Amino acid sequence: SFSGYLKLTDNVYIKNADIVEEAKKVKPTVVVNAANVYLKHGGGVAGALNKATNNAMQVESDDYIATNGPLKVGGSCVLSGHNLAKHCLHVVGPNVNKGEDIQLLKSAYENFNQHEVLLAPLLSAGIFGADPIHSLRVCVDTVRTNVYLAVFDKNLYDKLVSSFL
Ligand SMILES: COc1ccc(NC(=O)Nc2ccncc2)cc1
User: Fold this and answer.
1) Residues lining ligand 1, judged by CB closer than 6 Å?
2) Which residues contact residue 26 at a Cβ distance below 8 angstroms, ignoring those fewer than 6 apart?
3) How far, in Å, from the CA of 52 to the mean position of ligand 1?
């Protein structure tokens, strides 16, 4: 199971780790992808998870979009986890850099409540432009199921833990 995580709350845990490496080792039931509405996994967590699947995640995602159209900002879909997890929950947090509404971050985290345990990144953090301290706050105040957060950046991880209320 998950190892080396620091307990933040009754249901939220955190570790300084690359979510790709965490997924390959743990093979959780659900890994969350920091997706965009088009499921175009170019960079950030999405690009890294997709590269770990040898692009199988992108091929599956393009078929999903061809059939269903784009997701909503704040929405999600469940697809295969390929070699990383049983499932991948592709969640679209608002991209602040694209002028998307930050208030949609709570809606994005609500998707996690449909899964009893998840390996996840902080939504809307990184290249999505939101303040990761705010993302962690919304996570702890929204998600009720067991969430194991992987924070890639060591310095951000230390700031997140040391500043956690
Ligand atoms: C062998 O090629 C590799 C390429 C990329 C990664 N990981 C990576 O970029 N992870 C990431 C985590 C959080 N935010 C953004 C990115 C690992 C191996």
Assistant:
1) 18-20, 44-45, 48, 51, 121, 126, 152
2) 1, 2, 119
3) 9
